[PDB]
RNA sequence: AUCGCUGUGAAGAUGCAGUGUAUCCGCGGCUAGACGGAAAGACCCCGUGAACCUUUACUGUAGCUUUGCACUGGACUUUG
Protein backbone atom coordinates (compact mmCIF):
# COMPACT_ATOMS: atom_id res chain seq x y z
CA UNK A 1 0.00 0.00 0.00
CA UNK A 2 2.35 2.70 1.26
CA UNK A 3 5.85 3.61 0.09
CA UNK A 4 8.35 3.18 2.90
CA UNK A 5 10.86 5.79 4.05
CA UNK A 6 12.82 4.04 6.85
CA UNK A 7 14.95 0.91 7.15
CA UNK A 8 15.17 0.43 10.94
CA UNK A 9 12.08 -1.82 11.03
CA UNK A 10 12.07 -5.61 11.38
CA UNK A 11 10.34 -6.32 8.04
CA UNK A 12 10.81 -2.97 6.31
CA UNK A 13 12.54 -2.24 3.01
CA UNK A 14 14.03 0.74 1.19
CA UNK A 15 11.29 1.59 -1.30
CA UNK A 16 9.45 -1.68 -1.85
CA UNK A 17 5.66 -1.66 -1.71
CA UNK A 18 4.42 -3.69 1.26
CA UNK A 19 0.94 -5.01 2.05
CA UNK A 20 0.51 -4.22 5.72
CA UNK A 21 -2.60 -3.96 7.89
CA UNK A 22 -4.75 -0.85 7.85
CA UNK A 23 -4.24 -0.29 11.56
CA UNK A 24 -0.46 -0.57 11.36
CA UNK A 25 -0.24 2.08 8.63
CA UNK A 26 -2.91 4.51 9.88
CA UNK A 27 -1.76 4.68 13.49
CA UNK A 28 2.01 4.23 13.61
CA UNK A 29 3.99 4.81 10.41
CA UNK A 30 2.18 7.72 8.75
CA UNK A 31 1.65 10.21 11.67
CA UNK A 32 5.40 10.13 12.41
CA UNK A 33 6.56 10.56 8.81
CA UNK A 34 8.03 7.13 8.07
CA UNK A 35 5.84 6.22 5.06
CA UNK A 36 3.81 7.70 2.21
CA UNK A 37 0.71 6.31 0.48
CA UNK A 38 1.39 5.27 -3.11
CA UNK A 39 -0.77 7.06 -5.67
CA UNK A 40 -0.52 8.26 -9.28
CA UNK A 41 -0.91 11.97 -8.47
CA UNK A 42 2.58 13.25 -7.55
CA UNK A 43 4.67 10.52 -9.22
CA UNK A 44 6.96 13.10 -10.87
CA UNK A 45 8.10 14.34 -7.44
CA UNK A 46 9.18 10.99 -5.96
CA UNK A 47 11.36 10.10 -8.97
CA UNK A 48 13.28 13.39 -8.73
CA UNK A 49 14.13 12.91 -5.03
CA UNK A 50 15.67 9.45 -5.54
CA UNK A 51 19.16 10.99 -5.41
CA UNK A 52 18.25 12.61 -2.07
CA UNK A 53 17.16 9.26 -0.60
CA UNK A 54 20.66 7.76 -0.58
CA UNK A 55 22.09 10.81 1.21
CA UNK A 56 19.47 10.62 3.97
CA UNK A 57 20.37 6.97 4.64
CA UNK A 58 24.06 7.84 5.20
CA UNK A 59 23.22 10.21 8.09
CA UNK A 60 20.89 8.24 10.38
CA UNK A 61 23.22 5.23 10.55
CA UNK A 62 26.28 7.49 10.86
CA UNK A 63 24.97 9.26 13.97
CA UNK A 64 24.68 5.94 15.83
CA UNK A 65 28.47 5.53 15.86
CA UNK A 66 28.84 8.68 17.99
CA UNK A 67 25.84 7.72 20.16
CA UNK A 68 26.47 4.21 21.53
CA UNK A 69 29.85 5.27 22.98
CA UNK A 70 28.13 7.26 25.75
CA UNK A 71 25.19 4.95 26.57
CA UNK A 72 27.17 1.92 27.81
CA UNK A 73 29.37 3.98 30.16
CA UNK A 74 27.30 2.88 33.22
CA UNK A 75 28.06 6.13 35.07
CA UNK A 76 24.46 6.66 36.24
CA UNK A 77 24.37 7.08 40.03
CA UNK A 78 20.98 6.45 41.64
C1' A B 1 -117.38 7.86 43.52
C1' U B 2 -110.41 4.16 47.55
C1' C B 3 -115.24 -1.28 53.31
C1' G B 4 -115.19 -6.87 55.84
C1' C B 5 -115.57 -12.21 54.83
C1' U B 6 -115.33 -16.95 52.07
C1' G B 7 -114.13 -18.64 47.38
C1' U B 8 -111.90 -17.89 42.25
C1' G B 9 -107.73 -16.21 39.48
C1' A B 10 -100.20 -15.20 36.05
C1' A B 11 -101.36 -19.93 41.84
C1' G B 12 -101.48 -14.23 49.00
C1' A B 13 -107.93 -9.11 45.70
C1' U B 14 -110.39 -1.86 48.08
C1' G B 15 -112.16 -3.16 42.19
C1' C B 16 -114.43 -10.44 39.77
C1' A B 17 -118.52 -13.93 42.00
C1' G B 18 -121.82 -14.78 46.20
C1' U B 19 -123.30 -12.64 50.80
C1' G B 20 -122.98 -9.41 55.31
C1' U B 21 -122.37 -4.58 57.28
C1' A B 22 -121.92 1.32 56.84
C1' U B 23 -125.71 8.95 57.55
C1' C B 24 -121.91 13.32 54.87
C1' C B 25 -116.94 15.77 56.72
C1' G B 26 -112.68 16.82 60.22
C1' C B 27 -108.90 16.77 64.21
C1' G B 28 -105.26 14.37 67.67
C1' G B 29 -102.87 9.59 68.18
C1' C B 30 -100.74 4.08 66.66
C1' U B 31 -98.37 1.66 62.48
C1' A B 32 -101.37 -4.51 60.41
C1' G B 33 -101.94 -3.58 54.78
C1' A B 34 -101.65 -0.95 50.10
C1' C B 35 -96.11 -7.46 47.50
C1' G B 36 -95.50 1.11 51.21
C1' G B 37 -91.04 5.20 49.35
C1' A B 38 -85.56 5.38 47.95
C1' A B 39 -81.59 2.56 44.70
C1' A B 40 -82.49 -0.86 35.79
C1' G B 41 -80.30 -6.84 42.97
C1' A B 42 -74.68 -6.83 45.13
C1' C B 43 -76.53 -13.39 46.27
C1' C B 44 -77.43 -16.94 41.67
C1' C B 45 -76.87 -18.06 36.50
C1' C B 46 -75.92 -16.24 31.41
C1' G B 47 -72.71 -13.01 27.58
C1' U B 48 -67.80 -17.06 21.94
C1' G B 49 -68.69 -9.36 28.09
C1' A B 50 -64.63 -5.89 30.68
C1' A B 51 -60.85 -5.22 34.09
C1' C B 52 -56.64 -6.21 37.55
C1' C B 53 -53.61 -10.31 39.72
C1' U B 54 -51.12 -15.69 39.55
C1' U B 55 -48.12 -19.58 37.43
C1' U B 56 -44.83 -24.96 35.43
C1' A B 57 -51.06 -21.93 30.01
C1' C B 58 -49.23 -20.26 24.76
C1' U B 59 -46.74 -16.61 21.87
C1' G B 60 -43.35 -12.98 22.55
C1' U B 61 -40.27 -9.05 24.61
C1' A B 62 -36.96 -5.23 28.60
C1' G B 63 -32.73 -6.56 30.99
C1' C B 64 -28.43 -9.83 31.63
C1' U B 65 -24.99 -13.08 29.23
C1' U B 66 -21.83 -16.52 25.08
C1' U B 67 -19.50 -16.34 20.44
C1' G B 68 -18.46 -14.29 14.99
C1' C B 69 -17.33 -9.35 12.01
C1' A B 70 -15.82 -4.04 12.71
C1' C B 71 -13.00 -0.05 15.68
C1' U B 72 -7.59 -3.27 15.87
C1' G B 73 -1.49 -3.07 15.89
C1' G B 74 4.30 -6.18 15.85
C1' A B 75 7.63 -9.34 18.28
C1' C B 76 8.81 -14.26 19.22
C1' U B 77 6.49 -18.86 20.16
C1' U B 78 3.30 -24.02 20.66
C1' U B 79 0.37 -26.59 17.28
C1' G B 80 -3.20 -28.08 12.82
MG1 LIG C 1 -108.16 -13.47 49.37
MG1 LIG D 1 -103.92 -1.89 43.28
MG1 LIG E 1 -81.51 -5.80 36.46
The three-state (H, E, C) secondary structure of A24-75, written as one string: HHHHHHHHHCCEEECCCCCHHHHHHCHHHHHHHHHHHCCCCCCCCCCCCCCC
Q: Domain range spanning residue A37?
A: 1-78
For this entry, resolution in Å reads 3.3
Which residues lie below 8 Å from residue A25, measured CB to CB, with a gap of 6+?
A1, A2, A35
Residue A72, CB-side half-sphere exposure with 13 Å CA sphere: 6
| Euclidean distance between CA atoms A22 and A53, whole angstroms | 26
| Euclidean distance between CA atoms A69 and A65, whole angstroms | 7
Tally of domains within chain A: 1
Measured CA A29 to C1' B53 distance, in angstroms:
66
Distance A78 CA to ligand 2 centre (A): 125
- Elucidation method: cryo-EM
Measured CA A57 to C1' B31 distance, in angstroms:
132
Nucleotides of B under 7 A from a protein CB: 71-76
How far, rounded to the nearest angstrom, does the alpha carbon of residue A14 sit from its chain's CA centroid?
8
Amino acid sequence: EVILLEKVANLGNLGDKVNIKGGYARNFLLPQGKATVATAENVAAFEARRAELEKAAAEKKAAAEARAAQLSELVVTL
